[PDB]
Structures are given as structure tokens and as C-alpha cells.
Ligand binder design. Structure first.
Ligand SMILES: [Ca+2]
Ligand SMILES: [Ca+2]
Ligand SMILES: [Zn+2]
Length: 1287
């Protein structure tokens, strides 16, 4: 157990637990400090830390000490005895809180027992030397006014009050002659400057601070956790493992980059959470090795120590026993000490990954910042930590008896205001970057708001070094984790070995290095005319002395005029916001503009499914103009083209080492040592893949995800500026009214702010999801593949290396040089899939990853789309696409492959995508339109198979071919074994749903089957179990290849590939998404057009067509003529028959050239009667359910309706459309739908039934039925002449 002593500042010095100490940095000169032993080996000196600081620097100035901290200054802190005593009692309370739980009690026990080794690097291995400043500190015994009598004591930790900056807590180690005992295995007296009352404030981006933009946001820290964070540094320093290694260094070559001190791995380890992941596995092992090497030096010292010259009273055995336990060394029955690898590993992991701020916070139910790399806010002052009503030893601020335990409400600034006070801004100093234009207006930007982008020098290149493989050689992995529960239950973690007495000889060698600090300018001026994130955010603000502003979509005007505020919301939103109204209409206007605000903000939920993008925030570019000028043009389009990359302010140069070669050592005549070597080399190979992935993750988190974090914060600020601006306008307009008017105005400012705030919260959630998706996308498509390329290269090099090794030892391997030959091929065959959870256990990051992998669209590895008269891959993997001259392309994303040799597309796929999952798993989807057979060429049509898409490599791959009315999918494995599955449509149907009509094809492949889906429905299936490996990343050639007719062609659209098997559900969804359009379509599936001649088809009367009756102004219905020749393979009904209709636009006299017909358009349905254009009319006064339509010349009669509304009542994909007659555009009076009706005719000569072109009210209720009735006689399709259909 840990005992925390009690005392008052004025208690008498007793030279034991209350002393006059001579601090290490005093160099044995100057004055002494009254110090209090709070626990064994730990001292508290309730006075400001002044070592290395100028007295005046304790005042706020035009300078700052740290570039990444909102620095608070207060020279009066601790300037009285009562203030010093309060500091003392507060420290006692914090220590009691720390030991209130086993985890914290153990941290203290480890620290108390982690006594510094007696000596350092300069001390002979045979000796213990206490006469060094890192081991002994002196206390003055003599009476006041004379340093006549001094006594030495051993100490572990000395905690002082703060230095100039109250909120800048720091743990300091002792350097002597340029070396640090605490960094070389020995450990040394540790010092700390700490302030309990002025604590840091933080706010989680992904989480709302009580969700109130008009209230105080964020949470304040529990000083006990802040102290434990420092105590962890103390722990590391005491065990001598606070080693230095390759640090994370910020790139500062660009003006938008955050400047900061180099960050050592030890600091990131101390924080925990995701931060250890920024330290590559290479560096993790580097640090591990250095610490182990340091301990070896200590264990050697224990085996050689014979005496202590500095203090004859030191019992050598007692210390050897204590140090053996401290470092967890093992000792044999003879007393020989050695390192136990298991015990060392456990100790190391416990100290680096067990005791972390994140783990401690979690255990103590204390909320803390999400990461070391999270913006810093202004600190606050805790009113009274000694008041149990506000802060307790057991629960800190989150007191359950006050219902503040839930959701860390006790630390919530918006909720627990009674616990703290805001700090006077006049006492705060912050490093700012003054961005000046070349003229010249300037904008100040806190350095903390800039992008933190780790420089390339931050990462280890150890992966490029060679590795000697031996029967020995084993894997090397360091799990940046340690089960906190076992640590809390570990029975032998805490020492039960006697702590030596602290009294020793007085220190006489005061040699020590004392740091010297100095402020630097708080403002750095730079010149740039760039208008990026900082400038855009700035344009959305207004000075405090202005109260009348107006919104503008002009960024430039917003910068020029103080009364103009930039807004990235719609033109209509902006206009309405600037509208001035009468008091009587003010309440209405407020409701309107506030509602508009929510609508605008909610556009952050916009979907873009047709472009294979589930979510996109269209206004991010306009809001920040971050990255590659995202404020220009249409952001959504730009995103569809370049993806996440366009949002990055800077594209990082990644470190992706050429993996060093392996050196396989041979063992002649040794069958085992040779086999072992081969195996070890294989396992080491995987370590290489893992370490590379870890190197990628570290860079992604410190150079990319950091930039996206800044963008998320930027959008939060942007949205708030918009709400603040609207709030300002509303206030101004309301205050223009008189008191009498105001009294009659029904407005609730809190309800307004509530609605605005809620809108922002909804938007932020979408924005965070969007940005996290972008971050993972960059990782997977722009980083991982580049690493895979090197790893695959490495594999190849290692492959022949191993085979050539199995060759050189062929003899010594006898009848096995083949068994292990394949053992190498099959091992280097299956590559390691990237799993983020392997490099981090951070829930946020893991969830981001899993979410990404759960989105089927992220499985797209090829997406050929039209953009600027060319076809490019928008999958994000950058396939090279060569479209040759003979390929016809249009903006409807359709492309035509003809019989010409130059009508082809060459696609070179990305070779670094996990495609060969080792069992075949991928899908291909596309739309196609295959022309009808030539009647005089039917034999060749059914006989000649021709390839249309071929993807082969090493005589293995896949291809899509066509043989007449059959489309074929074929797979060929490395052995040449072939399997096919096909879809063949009937060519004897009166009316075919497939011939010359666009239809959707989807082919899926898995370990068992090959399936072909047509328009979302499964059509064919082939068992492909026997098929072995199939290379599918070869070049893809789109070209008609075979014995084809010169007239042969094929149209294709939306070609894409998925590296997974699509489900029937995925396919059906894709079919509907790609079928969707605002416009109606024609019989063939193309957009329906105005001013284009069409024959009419009736889905409910397939073989019927319309003809103007010779003797009457009506359309009689006749039977389609049919294929006349004698071929046994074909049959169809003629399509180019009946009246030639033409659709004309109703309004806008923009002439009659042509255009696209959209659902709900009002039209005129006309047709040609010889040299005249006639029209389809409905007699206005029929009383029956239906009537024959009236066909006559164009004219305007008061007795006939002439306006039709084209409709689409079917919710599912169809090329059918309906035609409605309404009394007039305005009314909701429906006359009926155009269809076909059967009439009975009994004349003097003939008696029979005849069908006529009619309008009927009966259809009105029928089109509402579900599922939509495709057989209804009111379903029509328009057939224009098409080269793909001849008769
Ligand atoms: Ca790491
Ligand atoms: Ca302005
Ligand atoms: Zn730290």
C-alpha cells in the first residue's frame, strides 16, 4: 500500500519529512527550498519553478515559450504562504485520488520503488557512486542563516509549482556531461513543474459538447489525470527507459503547415490510444532494442559491483537485491544475475503500453482528449478542488450523487459551470501566423489551426536493410498493447523488496546541465496571396464594432467590406437572409429563413449513387476552398473525378523502402538447419509485409488523417460562422422595430438557436462521416497499393533467392528439394491482407475502417466513365485507359465498338490490388445493346462467335464473347482448364425484350459458381469448382474480335469491375440506380426526344399498331405484319409500321429543333399524314368511360383537348410511358389515359369486333395498383428507325 503523508506549509522543519532542500538545478549555490515528503522518495516544493527562466518572463508578453499552447501567465500564483499551503493540500488530495484505485496505486508504488541506480555511464562497472546530481540531493540541517551543515538524501521525484506558463506541465530529467541517466538504463532524480487549478480544455470533433453552439463547448481536464500523465514520464525516467529515437518532425516548408517541436515516441507512448500507431513497428523495435541493451549494461554492473566509494554506509547486498527486483532480473543459486527475456518483455510492455494516459483515463472514468494531435483550447480555472461538493477523491468531478457521473457531465463546460471560471484573455499568449497579402491586408491564424503534416524524415528506413536468415533467426513483433486488467491483477508487479534508507553522504559534485529557456515572437509574419481555408473562414466573420451585415456569395466582396459576410449556402438562402420586412411579417420571415438554414445545412446528406458515391457534402469546397481550389466549379463533379485527394492541402511524399535482400546462411550436410533457414526466411517475409503496412499506417495518421481532421474542424467553424451571421442579422432587424412593435412580435430566440444548432449537429455528423470515408479511401487507394508494389517486388526477389538456395543445397536436401520447392511457391503465393486493427486498437479508427469495408462500392476496382470526350477510370485506382480512334463516345456514357481495327479500348489495370484472393472472387457489370441479325446473314450470325472484351495474361484470364443471340462468359485457369456460362435470348419472339435494346448484365464469380444476371435477375449458373487459379489483372482489350460482318457493332455503357461477388440484392440495386432518369426512354432504351419521328408500340397489345382510318378521323388498330422469309431460326413482328408520330413541346417558343422529353412534360402528340402534320385530340364532352381519340390537322378548337402530360407511373425500370389528358395544366381534373379499346361493330354486311386508339378513365385507377401492371393498354413505347434493327 501507499501512504500519503499530511502536513501544513507552516509545520516546522524536522530534517526528516519536512526539510530545506537544495534542488539539483541550484548547482549547490543560492538558496534552499522548504520541501515536504508526500510519500517515500517523493517531494513537494510549493513554489514556482524558476530554473532557466528570466524573472520578467513570468509576465505575459509579446512572446511565447511553446508554439502549440494557449499560454496562461500569472506571476502571483503561489506568492503567499496560504497559497503555498493550498498547493500542498491540493497535491495531497490528488495523490489520494490517484491511489483510490489499484491502477494508480501501482503507478505510485512502481515510482516509489523505482530508485535510481547508484551511478551513471561514467561510473566504473565495479562501483556504486552516490556523489552525482542525479542520485543525491542535499538538505540543510544547520540553523537559519548558515549553510554550515548539509546532509544527503536519495530521491526519486521532486514536484515544483509551475514555471512562467501555469498550464504547461512538464517532467524534467537530469543531464550531466551531455548524457541522461534516465535515458540510459540507470534512471535519475526526476523533476516536475505542475499546476493543479489551471487545466486544459478539449473538445471531441466526432462528438458534440452537449450539442450547443451558443453555449460553452468542450470539457475540462481532471488534474489527477494530468498529474498521472506526468507521473508516467517520471516512471519512464526512473527506470531509465525515457530513450530518444527517430522523432516525428513536422514538415514546415509550406505556410499552411503547423510548426511544433519534434515529438519523441516516448511521448506518444505515454498518451496511448492511437498515438503509438504513429510510431512505426521499425522504430518500436529500435526503442525496444535500445532499452534492452541498456538493461544488459545494468545487469552486467550488478554482477561486477564490489563497493561504494562515496558512501561507506551503503549496504551493497541491499542495493543489488533492490536493483534485481527493479529491473526484474533473475538470479541463479550462485547469485549470478541475468536478463530473463519473458520478464523483460512484460516489464517493458507494462511501462510503455500499460501505464498510459488513455488506459488510466478509461479506468478512472475520466474523459480526456482523443489524441496527442488534437487542437488545444484556452485553459480554465477550477474554483476549489478542495471542495468535496465539486471534486472528490473517489470520483473527481463526475460525482454520481450530483448525477454527473453519466457521460462525464462533471467535466462538461456547458453543464458543470459551478466548477470552473474562464481565464482573463489579457493574460493569454498564443503563437500566431500572420498571413499578409502582397499589397496588404493580413489575417492572423493561430498556429494550432494549421495543418500538422509530419515530414518524411519522421519515418524509419530500416526496412531497406539486409537481413541474415539462420536456423536461429526468429520473428520480431512488438504489440503496442498490454492487458490493463492483468496489470491491475499482476501479483509480482509491485516490489516486496525493502526500500533502502534515504539518508546518505552530502553531495559535493554539483556538476549538472541546466536548461535555459527563452520566449520567441508570438507572431510570425509571412506573405501569401493564397485564398485557402484560413482566408475563406475569415471571410465569414465580422468585427465586433459592426452590427449590421448582409450575406454574400462573393468571397472577394466579403473580404473587402466589413459589413459583407461570405456564405457558401444557396443564392436563395442568401437573398432571403438579406430581406427586410414589416413587423407584422417578421415572425414569418424568421421561421422561413431559419427553416432555410436547416435545409441548406442538411444538404450534407446528398447522395450520388449514379456516380457510385453514397455520400457527398456538396458545399465543402465553397465553404473552405481547401486543397486544390475546391471552391471553383462544381465540387461534386471534381470529387467524382479525383476523389479524396482534392481535399488535401498537401500531397505527402511517402516513404516506401525497397525491402532489403535476405542472406540465407548455409549449413552443409545439415538437413535441419537448412530447412529451418528456408522456413524462417518465409516467416520473416511476413514480418516485412506487416512492418511495411505499419509504416503506411503511421504516415497515413500523421500526414493525411491530420489534414482531414483540420478540414472537419474547419467545417464546424464554417457552419457556426453561418449560424452566428444569421443570428446577427435577425437581431439587427428585430431591434430596428420599436418597443411597441416588438411586444407584438412573436419570436423565441432560444427556439431559433435551438433549431439552428440542431441543424448544425446533423450536418456535422454527415460531414464527419464523409471526411472519415475520404481519409480511409486515400489510405486504401493512394497509399496501400504503393506499398504492395514494393512488397510484391520483394517477394519475387526473395522467391528466386530461396529457390536458388534450395538448388545450391539440392544434395544436402536429397528427396525434399522439391517438397520445399513448392513450399516456397505456395507461401509466397498468398499475400497478407491489410488489417488496420493489427496496428491500432483505437475504436474510432477501427470503426472508420470497418464501415469503409462494409460499403460494397469501395469494392469497385474499375469504373469506366465518360468525362471530356474520353473514357477514364474513376475507381480511384488509376487504371490507364487508351481509347483508340474508332471508338464512338457520347455524354450519355455510351460507347460503340465497330468492325474497324482501330475501334478498341486498352485498359492497363493496377497490379497492386488484392485481386487474386486465392479462390476467385469478383464481378463485372455493364449495359449492352446488341444489334438485330441481318435476315440475309442469319447463318453466320448464329455460327460465328466473336470476342468483345478480353482480359488475358499468361494464357489465363477471362473474356466476354458473343455468338449471335448468346453472350458468353469464359474463365481460363493457369492450367488451361476452361469453363463457361452464357445467356441466350430468343430470336423467334414476336417482340423481344432484348434484341437491339439496352439491357443490364452482371457476372459474378466465387469459389463455386459463375453466375450471369440480366436486368437484376439470375439467368445462368455454372459450377466452377475444378477451375484453379485465374489471373484477372491482365490488360483488358475492348474490341470485336472474330469472323464478323463489316456491319457488326456493339454499344456498351457503365463498364465496371468489383473485386468481390455481388449479391442478387446488390445487383438489383445497381440495376435500378443505373436505370434511373428524369427523362423517359424510347423502345431501344435511349432518351426519348422531341421532334423525332417514332412509330408507337403498345405493351398491352404487342402485335397491334395504329393507322389513321381512311374514312374517319380515328386511329384503327391493326395487326403487325411479320418476318416473311423461310428461315427456321427467326421470327418477329415488324416495328416500322403504322403512323409516324412526332412529339412536340407545349410551351416556350424556342422553335422546334429537338430536345429531351422529361416526366411530367406537357406535349402535343402529332403524326404525319402525307405532307401534313396532324394531331391527337380528345373530344371534351364525352360522358362514357372511354372514347375514340380524334385525329385531325393542327388547329385550336374549344371542343377538343389537345394537351397531353407524359407520365411514368411505374416505379420499377421500364421503357414504357403513359399519356394523360388533363382539363388543363393547372387543374387536377384528369380526363383519362391514352390506350386501346375494343368495340363491337354490326353492319348490314359485316359483324365483328375492332380496336381503336382511345382515351379511358378506367386506366386512372389501374396505374396506381402495385406491382405496376405492365400489361395495361395504356403503356406505350416509341420506336424510332435504328441501324441496329432492319426488317
Ligand atoms: Ca507503434
Ligand atoms: Ca466582410
Ligand atoms: Zn507528455
Amino acid at each position: 500500500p501507499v501512504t500519503i503523508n499530511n502536513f501544513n506549509y507552516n509545520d516546522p522543519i524536522d530534517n526528516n519529512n519536512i526539510i530545506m532542500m537544495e534542488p539539483p538545478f541550484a548547482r549547490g549555490t543560492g538558496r534552499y527550498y522548504k520541501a515536504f515528503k508526500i510519500t517515500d522518495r517523493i517531494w513537494i516544493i510549493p513554489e514556482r519553478y524558476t530554473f532557466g527562466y528570466k524573472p520578467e518572463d513570468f509576465n505575459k508578453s509579446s512572446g511565447i515559450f511553446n508554439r502549440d499552447v494557449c499560454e496562461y501567465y500569472d506571476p502571483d500564483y503561489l506568492n503567499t504562504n496560504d497559497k503555498k499551503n493550498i498547493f500542498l493540500q491540493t497535491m495531497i488530495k490528488l495523490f489520494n485520488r490517484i491511489k483510490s484505485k489499484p491502477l494508480g496505486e501501482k503507478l505510485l508504488e512502481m515510482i516509489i520503488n523505482g530508485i535510481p541506480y547508484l551511478g551513471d555511464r561514467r561510473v566504473p562497472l565495479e562501483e556504486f557512486n552516490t556523489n552525482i546530481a542525479s542520485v543525491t540531493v542535499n538538505k540543510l540541517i544547520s540553523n537559519p542563516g548558515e549553510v554550515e551543515r548539509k546532509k544527503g538524501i536519495f530521491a526519486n521525484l521532486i514536484i515544483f509549482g509551475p514555471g512562467p506558463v501555469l498550464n504547461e506541465n512538464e517532467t524534467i530529467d537530469i543531464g550531466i556531461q551531455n548524457h541522461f541517466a534516465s535515458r540510459e538504463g540507470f534512471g535519475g532524480i526526476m523533476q516536475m513543474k505542475f499546476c493543479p487549478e489551471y487545466v486544459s480544455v478539449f473538445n471531441n470533433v466526432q462528438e458534440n459538447k452537449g450539442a450547443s453552439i451558443f453555449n460553452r463547448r468542450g470539457y475540462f481536464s481532471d488534474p489527477a489525470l494530468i498529474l498521472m500523465h506526468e507521473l508516467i514520464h517520471v516512471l519512464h525516467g526512473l527506470y531509465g527507459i525515457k530513450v530518444d529515437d527517430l522523432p516525428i518532425v513536422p514538415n514546415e516548408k509550406k505556410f499552411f503547415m503547423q510548426s511544433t517541436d519534434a515529438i519523441q515516441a516516448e511521448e506518444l507512448y505515454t498518451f496511448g490510444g492511437q498515438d503509438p500507431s504513429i510510431i512505426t513497428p521499425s522504430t518500436d523495435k529500435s526503442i525496444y532494442d535500445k532499452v534492452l541493451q541498456n538493461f544488459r549494461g545494468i545487469v552486467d554492473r550488478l554482477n561486477k559491483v564490489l563497493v561504494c566509494i562515496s558512501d561507506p554506509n551503503i549496504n551493497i547486498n541491499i542495493y543489488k537485491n533492490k536493483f534485481k527486483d527493479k529491473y526484474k532480473f533473475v538470479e541463479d543459486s550462485e547469485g549470478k544475475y541475468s536478463i530473463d527475456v519473458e520478464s523483460f518483455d512484460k516489464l517493458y510492455k507494462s511501462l510503455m503500453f500499460g501505464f498510459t494516459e488513455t488506459n488510466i483515463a478509461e479506468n478512472y472514468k475520466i474523459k480526456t482528449r482523443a489524441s496527442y494531435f488534437s487542437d488545444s483550447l484556452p485553459p480554465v480555472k477550477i474554483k476549489n478542488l478542495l471542495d468535496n461538493e465539486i471534486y472528490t477523491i473517489e470520483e473527481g468531478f463526475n460525482i454520481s450523487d450530483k448525477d454527473m457521473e453519466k457521460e462525464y457531465r462533471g467535466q462538461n463546460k456547458a453543464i458543470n459551470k459551478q466548477a470552473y471560471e474562464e481565464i482573463s484573455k489579457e493574460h493569454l499568449a498564443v503563437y500566431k501566423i500572420q498571413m499578409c497579402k502582397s499589397v496588404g491586408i493580413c489575417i492572423d491564424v493561430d498556429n494550432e489551426d494549421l495543418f500538422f503534416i509530419a515530414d518524411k524524415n519522421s519515418f524509419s528506413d530500416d526496412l531497406s536493410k539486409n537481413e541474415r536468415i539462420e536456423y536461429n533467426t526468429q520473428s520480431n513483433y512488438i504489440e503496442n498493447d498490454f492487458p490493463i486488467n492483468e496489470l491491475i491483477l499482476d501479483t509480482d508487479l509491485i516490489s516486496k523488496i525493502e526500500l533502502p534508507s534515504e539518508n546518505t553522504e552530502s553531495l559535493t559534485d554539483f556538476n549538472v546541465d541546466v536548461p535555459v529557456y527563452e520566449k520567441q515572437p508570438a507572431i510570425k509574419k509571412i506573405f501569401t496571396d493564397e485564398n485557402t481555408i484560413f482566408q475563406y473562414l475569415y471571410s465569414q466573420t465580422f468585427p465586433l464594432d459592426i452590427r449590421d451585415i448582409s450575406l454574400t456569395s462573393s468571397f472577394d466582396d466579403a473580404l473587402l467590406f466589413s459589413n459583407k459576410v461570405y456564405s457558401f449556402f444557396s443564392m436563395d438562402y442568401i437573398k432571403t437572409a438579406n430581406k427586410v420586412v414589416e413587423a407584422g411579417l417578421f415572425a414569418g420571415w424568421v421561421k422561413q429563413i431559419v427553416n432555410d438554414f436547416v435545409i441548406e445545412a442538411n444538404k450534407s446528406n446528398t447522395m450520388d449513387k449514379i456516380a457510385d458515391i453514397s455520400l457527398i457534402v456538396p458545399y465543402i469546397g465553397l465553404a473552405l476552398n481547401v486543397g486544390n481550389e475546391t471552391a471553383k466549379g462544381n465540387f461534386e463533379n471534381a470529387f467524382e473525378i479525383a476523389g479524396a485527394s482534392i481535399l488535401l492541402e498537401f500531397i505527402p511524399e511517402l516513404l516506401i523502402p525497397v525491402v532489403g535482400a535476405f542472406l540465407l546462411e548455409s549449413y552443409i550436410d545439415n538437413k535441419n538447419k537448412i530447412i529451418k533457414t528456408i522456413d524462417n526466411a518465409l516467416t520473416k517475409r511476413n514480418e516485412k509485409w506487416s512492418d511495411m503496412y505499419g509504416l503506411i499506417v503511421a504516415q497515413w495518421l500523421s500526414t493525411v488523417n491530420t489534414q482531414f481532421y483540420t478540414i472537419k474542424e474547419g467545417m464546424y467553424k464554417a457552419l457556426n460562422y453561418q449560424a452566428q451571421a444569421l443570428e446577427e442579422i435577425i437581431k439587427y432587424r428585430y431591434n430596428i422595430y420599436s418597443e411597441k412593435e416588438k411586444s407584438n412580435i412573436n419570436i423565441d430566440f432560444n427556439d431559433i438557436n435551438s433549431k439552428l444548432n440542431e441543424g448544425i449537429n446533423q450536418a456535422i455528423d454527415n460531414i464527419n462521416n464523409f471526411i472519415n470515408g475520404c481519409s480511409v479511401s486515400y489510405l486504401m487507394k493512394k497509399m496501400i497499393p504503393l506499398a504492395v508494389e514494393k512488397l510484391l517486388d520483394f517477394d519475387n526477389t526473395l522467391k528466386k533467392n530461396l529457390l536458388n538456395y534450395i538448388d545450391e543445397n539440392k544434395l544436402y536436401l536429397i528427396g525434399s528439394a522439391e517438397y520445399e520447392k513448392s513450399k516456397v511457391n505456395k507461401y509466397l503465393k498468398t499475400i497478407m491482407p491489410f488489417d488496420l486493427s493489427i496496428y491500432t486498437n483505437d475504436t474510432i479508427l477501427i470503426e472508420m475502417f470497418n464501415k469503409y469495408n462494409s460499403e460494397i462500392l469501395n469494392n469497385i476496382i474499375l469504373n469506366l466513365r465518360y468525362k471530356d470526350n474520353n473514357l477514364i477510370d474513376l475507381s480511384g485506382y488509376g487504371a490507364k485507359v487508351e481509347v483508340y480512334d474508332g471508338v464512338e463516345l457520347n455524354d450519355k456514357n455510351q460507347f460503340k465498338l465497330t468492325s474497324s481495327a482501330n475501334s478498341k479500348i486498352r485498359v492497363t489495370q493496377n497490379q497492386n490490388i488484392i485481386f487474386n484472393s486465392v479462390f476467385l472472387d469478383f464481378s463485372v457489370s455493364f449495359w449492352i445493346r446488341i444489334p438485330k441479325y441481318k435476315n440475309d446473314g442469319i447463318q453466320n450470325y448464329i455460327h460465328n462467335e466473336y470476342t468483345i472484351i478480353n482480359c488475358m495474361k499468361n494464357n489465363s484470364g477471362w473474356k466476354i464473347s458473343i455468338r449471335g443471340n448468346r453472350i458468353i462468359w469464359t474463365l481460363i485457369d493457369i492450367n488451361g482448364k476452361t469453363k463457361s456460362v452464357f445467356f441466350e435470348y430468343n430470336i423467334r419472339e414476336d417482340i423481344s425484350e432484348y434484341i437491339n435494346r439496352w439491357f443490364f448484365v452482371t457476372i459474378t464469380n466465387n469459389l463455386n459458381n459463375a453466375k450471369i444476371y440480366i436486368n437484376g435477375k439470375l439467368e445462368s449458373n455454372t459450377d466452377i469448382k475444378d477451375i484453379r487459379e485465374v489471373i484477372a489483372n491482365g490488360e483488358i482489350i475492348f474490341k470485336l474480335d472474330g469472323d464478323i460482318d463489316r456491319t457488326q457493332f456493339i454499344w456498351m455503357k457503365y463498364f465496371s469491375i468489383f473485386n468481390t461477388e455481388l449479391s442478387q440484392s446488390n445487383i438489383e440495386e445497381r440495376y435500378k440506380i443505373q436505370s434511373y432518369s428524369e427523362y423517359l426512354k424510347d423502345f431501344w432504351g435511349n432518351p426519348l426526344m422531341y421532334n423525332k419521328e417514332y412509330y408507337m408500340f403498345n405493351a398491352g397489345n404487342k402485335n397491334s399498331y395504329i393507322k389513321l382510318k381512311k374514312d374517319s378521323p380515328v386511329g384503327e388498330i391493326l395487326t403487325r405484319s411479320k418476318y416473311n422469309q423461310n428461315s427456321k431460326y427467326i421470327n418477329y413482328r415488324d416495328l416500322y409500321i403504322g403512323e409516324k408520330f412526332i412529339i412536340r413541346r407545349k410551351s416556350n417558343s424556342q422553335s422546334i429543333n429537338d430536345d429531351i422529353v422529361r416526366k411530367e412534360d406537357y406535349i402535343y402528340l402529332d403524326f404525319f399524314n402525307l405532307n401534313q402534320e396532324w394531331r391527337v385530340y380528345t373530344y371534351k364532352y364525352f360522358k362514357k368511360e372511354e372514347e375514340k381519340l380524334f385525329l385531325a390537322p393542327i388547329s385550336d378548337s374549344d371542343e377538343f383537348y389537345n394537351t397531353i402530360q407524359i407520365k411514368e407511373y411505374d416505379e420499377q425500370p421500364t421503357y414504357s410511358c403513359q399519356l394523360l389528358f388533363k382539363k388543363d395544366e393547372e387543374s387536377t381534373d384528369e380526363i383519362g389515359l391514352i390506350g386501346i379499346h375494343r368495340f363491337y361493330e354490326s353492319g348490314i354486311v359485316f359483324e365483328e369486333y375492332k380496336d381503336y386508339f382511345c382515351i379511358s378513365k378506367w386506366y386512372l385507377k389501374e396505374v396506381k395498383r402495385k406491382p405496376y401492371n405492365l400489361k395495361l393498354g395504356c403503356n406505350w413505347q416509341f420506336i424510332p428507325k435504328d441501324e441496329g434493327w432492319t426488317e
